[PDB]
């Protein structure tokens, strides 16, 4: 009984299948990001986090039979989602037009702070983050355009860009670095991600699947 979610007229299908991997994923949650200007929340993007179908069996061991309220306050639960042995697919769709460098600047900031935070920001991670930046330089995201982060459990982060919300056929780049590969999702649902919309969605939707 997995449903879809619409955010500012941007829809996130309940389930999806990738042309690049051939696996299928279910919508784990959705929400929105932006900037708070003069006390006002200014929306710029919508975010959807998908989990590989096999994430259920994996998470079932430790989190089956827990209330949504209980999962939401448990950090270890989100750590399993972030680093669990399955792919996570994040799709960010624009509400307001941002150039590749405009959008990527803040993402990279949050990722670098996290990486330095946990002591995993050496030359390799720096180089990987530069490659990350390099991939965004040639693109522009008008309203509706999307960015796809494919977090492979094998320590690789795949980057895709779409004129709209349909999954691209090929990936634009592969960031091969373990620490960086999970940094992006970390800044969305990790312990130091202020916005709880995504975290709450995960707590509210997962319990159902874990029980069957
Ligand atoms: O989904 C977004 C929006 C993006 C953003 C939005 C508006 C202006 C600059 C950057 O910031 C982010 C930073 C992150 O670590 C993760 C996700 C996002």
Cα distances from 65 to residues 62, 84, 157, 210, in angstroms, run: 9, 18, 31, 7
Catalytic residue flag (residue 33): yes
Neighbour order of strands in the sheet with 146-152: 15-17, 24-37, 40-52, 88-94, 146-152, 156-162, 173-176
State the Cα–Cα distance between residues 142 and 172, nearest whole angstrom: 18
Return the residue whose CA atom lies nearest to atom 2 of ligand 1. Answer: 33
Q: Strand 156-162 to strand 140-141: parallel, antiparallel, or no bridges (unpaired)? A: unpaired
Domains of the chain by start residue, with CATH:
1-54+84-188 (3.50.70.10), 55-83+189-212 (1.10.890.20)
Catalytic residue flag (residue 150): no
> How far apart are the CA of 32 and the centre of ligand 1, in A?
9
Q: Which atom of ligand 1 is nearest to the CA of 106?
A: 10
Print the SS3 string covering the chain: CCCCEEECCEEECCEEECCCCCCEEEEEEEEEEEEEECCEEEEEEEEEEEEECCHHHHHHHHHCCCCHHHHHCCHHHHHHHHHCCCCEEEEEEECCCEEHHHHHHHHHHHHHHHHHHCCCCCHHHHHHHHHHHHHHCCCEECCCCEEEEEEECCCEEEEEEECCCCCCCCCCEEEECHHHHHHHHHHHHCCCCCCCHHHHHHHHHHHHHHCC
State the Cα–Cα distance between residues 71 and 52, nearest whole angstrom: 19
Cα distances from 13 to residues 2, 18, 30, 50, 91, in angstroms, run: 10, 13, 11, 10, 11
Could you tell me if residue 130 is left (phi over 0), alpha (psi between -120 and 50 degrees) or otherwise beta?
Answer: alpha
Catalytic residue flag (residue 25): no
> How far apart are the CA of 139 and the centre of ligand 1, in A?
16
Q: Which of 94, 150, 199, 205 is catalytic?
A: 94
**Which pair of structure tokens corresponds to residue 165?**
């919300």
Catalytic residue flag (residue 94): yes
Asked whether 31 and 197 are in contact (CB, 8 A), the reply is: yes
Q: Resolution in Å, one decimal, please.
A: 2.3
Beta carbons within 8 Å of 109's beta carbon, 6+ residues apart: none
Return the residue whose CA atom lies nearest to atom 15 of ligand 1. Answer: 107
> How far apart are the CA of 80 and the centre of ligand 1, in A?
23
Any ligand 1 atom below 6 A from CB of 21? no
């Amino acid at each position: 009984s997995i449903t879809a979610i619409t955010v500012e007229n941007l829809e996130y299908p309940a389930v999806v299948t990738s042309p690049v991997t051939g696996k299928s994923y279910f919508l784990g949650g959705a929400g929105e990001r932006g900037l708070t200007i003069e006390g006002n929340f200014i929306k710029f993007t919508a975010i959807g986090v998908y989990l590989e179908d096999i994430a259920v069996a994996s998470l079932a061991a430790k989190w089956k039979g827990k209330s949504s309220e209980e999962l939401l306050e448990t950090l270890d639960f989100y750590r399993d989602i972030i680093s669990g042995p399955f792919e996570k697919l994040i799709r960010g769709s624009k509400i307001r037009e941002l150039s590749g460098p405009e959008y990527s600047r803040k993402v990279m900031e949050n990722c670098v702070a996290h990486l330095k935070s946990v002591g995993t920001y050496g030359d390799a991670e720096a180089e990987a983050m530069q490659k990350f930046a390099e991939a965004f330089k040639p693109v522009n995201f008008p309203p509706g355009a999307s960015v796809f982060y494919r977090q492979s459990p094998d320590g690789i982060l795949g980057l895709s860009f779409s004129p709209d919300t349909s999954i691209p056929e090929k990936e634009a780049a592969l960031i091969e670095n373990k620490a960086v590969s999970s940094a992006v999702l970390e800044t969305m649902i990790g312990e130091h991600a202020v916005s709880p919309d995504l975290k709450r969605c995960l707590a509210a939707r997962l319990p159902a699947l874990l029980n069957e």
